[PDB]
Structure 1
């Protein structure tokens, strides 16, 4: 069985389980079941399944070098699939709630979930809660007797909290820390003093890397009973790196990829986001460039956004991106090498993760 086709099959099985259970134990009626079925498919399907598929890929890696009965190979692949879906549904939770929080319009060239006419914000916030609750229902059901149940639940729990903390860093990244105050409406920064590499890095680490890279890799290890083939500090460091890199790409695209091909109109400029472009631009601007940036950043007005785009264009950020790229390629090879020591196989899995990131 090919990996993707196994993964998608397990979706159908997990969906049927969750919906059947709503009927038999939660007194749901057909039409509400259909609503939740459509919600699940619209929010969970349609991307590349990179995160879910990484758990499958890590487990397939260990399968090739570990002696197992066939039924045991099958159980581990099924566990890897269910695990991947947990991460997919965790992401779906985050995307639904984030889209509502940020007033987004589109995602994947389709409307955000809350903007569907029969959904609305009132239902969508709760739908996003259900998506995450489903991750736990899956885990307690499929993994109830598994030796890795507690470690998986505990990891999932930490990643989720880290992500929510990351979200908070992200949404507050245009404020001056010393002005945060629930009693007082928050002005956008005027000095941009908090637009630094280290601050940028902290947003991306919490907001993205833990759920996008750390979780899928470590879940792979957990379902394979293989956490002893690795140095968990290395896995963290390599995930950090690749994750930060992933975000730098998506920050460049928010600004420069055509809307049709992005799946979204980008608004990082107008939301006054601590993007890599803004940080890197401020790291090399002269005084007159900094005043012009400040006059035009974080304003809805299209003329002012066109000015920020102009400033980045003439800043030769491509040179900074190539230099950043070169250093990440450098460091990730070092970490892959250090991971070769204990696990050739895991290190290959991280290699493949790195490749699928380094392209798109």
Structure 2
């Protein structure tokens, strides 16, 4: 049911956008077709957990003829897509920024045969503009419009900030200067857990966990009924854990099931495995690491992979995962004391995160 309704609204959104382009932007059939393909390829294919959560959080707060339910649930699907389209935008640019080859089993958007990298960058921009176009089209008369968009934009902004932290993590920040070049850090002094948590919090936690919950509460007109301090704590913790899983899979999950080929080591990324490894590594391990990380060379990539394996990072992950699970639990219980319906929707989201396989 959730997915069926969500997809019906997707076509409704697509039709509005595509036809408006034809009618008011003087767009030809060829480019409309291109944009329809671009939209489907960049927005469809995932598990839609960010978008579906909005619908689930909205439906579950429906208690605080059917008219209302129909409006609230449809507003929820629109918001769900706003987030899915926002993500799509970031993913298109991110793939370019991370030099990835595939995503969701297919080539990254900018690696498609008839898609130039220069056009891909702009298509990414179109994806984000669409979030605002659909928002105005469906919510122009809603009282929550301003607060809704004010929050959406702040999260958009925090994600861009996190991406800044992500792409500048392997460069000595003390030497960060637009006018003078510098190579990848060679002492990796900044690959610390503190720095890692900051990167992940802003680039993933906010738009992946907090925004779906907040938008769900807003279209449900129940925002004030929840402890926001606890909700944010929960979103931040679940968000970090999700990126950790993302980092681990990048290195150890086969691309067949992952749907995307990892580039974290190649890109010398400040991943969870890298910081956790470096924090426990002996002097010998650190030396060998430094001499193999950040290279495309296949053997040096398998050597970094072996190190992690030898330093029992898989064991470290299990420990961490268990510590997260207990905090989430104590936090959801705190939520439940005043927001039983909301806390249950949160449990569901957790169920889609805990030990996810993809």
Indicate if the aligned counterparts of 2:170 and 2:269 stay in contact, CA closer than 8 A.
Answer: yes
Structure 1 position 359, deviation (Å): 2.9
- Given the two structures, how large is their TM-score scaled by the length of structure 2? 0.97
* Superposition TM-score, scaled by structure 1 size: 0.97
Q: Pick which of 156-165 and 181-190 moved more.
A: 181-190
Shift of 1:101: 1.8
Assess if the C-alpha contact under 8 Å between 2:86 and 2:127 holds in 1. Answer: yes
Runs of 4+ residues over 4 Å off in structure 1: none
Residue 103 of structure 2 is aligned to residue 104 of structure 1: no
Which residue in the other structure is 2:184 paired with?
Answer: 188
Cα distance in 1 for partners of 2:198, 2:340 equals 30
Write out aligned runs for 1:1-360 (5 A). 2-63=1-62, 65-66=63-64, 69-360=65-356
Measured in 2, the distance between the counterparts of 1:270 and 1:31 equals 38
Unaligned runs of 5+ in 2: none
**Equivalent residues of 2:209, 2:238 under 8 A apart:** yes
What is the alpha-carbon distance in structure 2 between the residues aligned to residue 296 and residue 163 of structure 1?
30
Distance 1:102 1:295 in 2: 21
The CA deviation at 1:341 is 2.0
- CA offset at residue 277 of structure 1? 0.6
**Judging changes above 3 Å, is the alpha-carbon distance between structure 1 residues 260 and 133 closer, same or farther for their aligned structure 2 residues?**
same
CA distance in 1, matches of 2:111, 2:167: 21
| Structure 1 unaligned spans of 5+ | none
- What's the RMSD between the two structures over aligned residues? 1.0
Aligned-residue offset at 1:247 = 0.8
How far 1:3 sits from its partner (Å)? 1.1
Give the whole-Å Cα distance in 1 for the aligned partners of 2:122 and 2:295.
Answer: 31
* In structure 2, distance between residues paired with 1:193 and 1:170: 15
Kindly indicate whether the alpha-carbon contact (under 8 Å) linking 2:104 and 2:260 is maintained by their aligned counterparts in 1: yes
Residue deviations 1:16-35 (CA, integer Å, cap 9, x gap) = 01111112211112111111
Q: What SS does the corresponding residue of 1:168 show, helix, strand or coil?
A: helix
Q: Deviations over 1:90-148 (max 9, x none)?
A: 00100111111222211111111112222211211111101100000111110111111
- Is the CA contact 2:196–2:270 (under 8 Å) kept in the aligned structure 1? yes
CA distance in 2, matches of 1:201, 1:122: 32
Structure 1 range deviating more: 228-237 or 4-13: 228-237
Q: For 1:322, what is the secondary structure of its paired residue?
A: helix
